[PDB]
Ligand binder design. Structure first.
Ligand code: AMP
Ligand code: AMP
Lengths: 182, 182
């Protein structure tokens, strides 16, 4: 059973409206499903959008933010809870402690570093929580091509690759995450 | 001036000999250039290969390894120094403290998480040390395609993208790293 889902997403909104539409769909879907949203606690970009959609639909939202970037990404004032921690490592360790699964929406280097960090923690045996990509147009196509290449070239085992699910529908991706097994 | 270079690379050797050839070329080139190699301190895979090539050519090598994975990746016994630290975060923080620049050889999820983590630290203003991709065949082509897309879609600023240089020649990449500017 999933009870809460951690979402990583851009602090920018992105160059076209499709990104915000995907964030809205996902926030709304999490709430409708009974799941708590865990996220970086910002009000900027897709972070703000996914929290707002979760809240508009009645969902619980917990934001996790380092002290050092409260003003930069604008700590969201209308969350169920906003947890302010000591630094970047603490933030990711806490989001993981509260989540049953992880979803990456489109984002930048921060979204990607979070995804990869948490993926390695599964690789190293610290958790067995599944990760997912919410696909928006062909945003992630070249990343998936690259990750599959890592398995062909034998830098990543198949079972480690298989921790990352993917879907363009929030419902179908959440189903894949809820059913996935080590 | 570069005095020391941190290398991230696979703990696997990879499915074909080209990867080991690139690691050998890079280790040998670092040593010939007078640069200290900083790396994860393993004797497995491309990690072992790049340290051995640096050492065979007379270079200094410093390995940085968490306590918890000494047996797993085989702490290298013939380094200038092997520093054993408390955990994963400590390892990356220490490699960064000792390096003037970062190079990613081909690798898996660990190589990628390290690259992305250190890249964000530049993004957040903690350092201004350049990063580089050593290109081996078209290994990184789809990653570069994806990263460029992040800038087109406005999830990453151009100046943040520009912290990552790239080359197939160790000499040309090291020149790009030594000359790069914020
Ligand atoms: N090393 C890191 N650890 C934790 N959070 C980070 C790190 N780097 C960036 N972030 C955050 O991730 C969020 C999403 O980043 P981005 O996808 O680059 O817009 C940013 O607002 C950053 O504050
Ligand atoms: N989160 C992490 N922090 C530091 N090192 C890591 C992490 N995940 C994996 N590694 C290391 O990076 C090395 C290269 O990994 P790979 O590229 O997956 O073969 C591995 O041997 C791991 O011990």
């Amino acid at each position: 059973t999933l009870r809460s889902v951690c979402v990583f997403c851009g602090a920018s909104p992105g160059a076209s409206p499709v990104y915000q539409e995907a964030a809205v769909a996902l926030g709304r879907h999490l709430a409708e499903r009974g799941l708590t949203l865990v996220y970086g606690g910002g009000a900027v970009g897709l972070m703000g959008t996914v929290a707002d959609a979760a809240l508009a639909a009645g969902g619980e939202v917990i934001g996790i933010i380092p002290q050092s970037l409260q003003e930069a990404e604008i700590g969201h004032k209308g969350l169920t809870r906003l947890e302010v921690v000591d630094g970047m490592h603490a933030r990711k360790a806490r989001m993981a402690e509260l989540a049953d699964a992880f979803i990456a929406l489109p984002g930048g280097l921060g979204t990607l570093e979070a995804l990869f960090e948490v993926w390695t923690w599964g690789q190293l045996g610290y958790h067995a929580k599944p990760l997912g990509l919410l696909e928006v147009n062909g945003f992630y196509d070249p990343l998936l091509t690259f990750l599959d290449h890592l398995v062909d070239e034998r830098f990543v085992r198949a079972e480690h690759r298989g921790m990352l699910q993917r879907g363009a529908s929030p419902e179908a991706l959440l189903d894949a995450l809820a059913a996935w097994t080590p």
